Design a protein around this ligand. Structure first.
Ligand SMILES: Nc1nc2c(ncn2[C@@H]2O[C@H](COP(=O)(O)OP(=O)(O)NP(=O)(O)O)[C@@H](O)[C@H]2O)c(=O)[nH]1
Ligand SMILES: [Ca+2]
Ligand SMILES: [Mg+2]
Length: 138
């Protein structure tokens, strides 16, 4: 019983940072307990049992690319998709709002979370969600 997770997204959004925090220990293994049940995770920083599409909240381009990739996945080859807006710490140079990120997620059938790899914020919550989500579909 594997849980392979593919890390997708535009350049420099924080993909490896998120993976390296979670792991582990680019392929990153790690066994977490959600939310009563042990679950193992294999996180793939490619640049699947779930796709994590990362954008930077300070980079509106990576956000639109994120949406573009979401519709691509929806048309190709179902699997959970998590939309992640990383770098929530850079409050001055933010170009995408939370609600804009959360509203995008609903309409296009994503789970949504904002993280900051810099502050280790919601990184654990992200990967616990992925497990929960894989579990909704299975
Ligand atoms: N302030 C802040 N900086 C972050 C955060 N996450 C990543 N960064 C910074 O953003 C840069 C890119 O991070 P990285 O994880 O390498 O992104 P990437 O998506 O792997 N880039 P690439 O696809 O080009 O390899 C790094 O210099 C890193 O320190 C975050 O949450 N907050
Ligand atoms: Ca189930
Ligand atoms: Mg990288």
């Amino acid at each position: 019983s594997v849980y392979k997770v593919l890390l997708l997204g535009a350049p420099g959004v924080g993909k490896s940072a998120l993976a390296r925090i979670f792991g582990g220990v680019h392929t990153y293994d790690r066994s977490i307990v959600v939310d009563g049940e042990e679950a193992s995770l294999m996180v793939y920083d490619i640049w699947g049992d779930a796709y994590v599409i990362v954008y930077s909240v300070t980079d509106k381009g990576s956000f639109e690319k994120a949406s573009e990739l979401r519709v691509q996945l929806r048309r190709a080859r179902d699997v959970p998709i998590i939309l992640v807006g990383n770098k929530s710490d850079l409050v001055r140079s933010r170009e995408v709002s939370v609600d804009e990120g959360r509203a995008c997620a609903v309409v296009f059938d994503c789970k949504f979370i904002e993280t900051s790899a810099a502050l280790h914020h919601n990184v654990q919550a992200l990967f616990e969600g992925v497990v929960r989500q894989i579990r909704l579909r299975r």
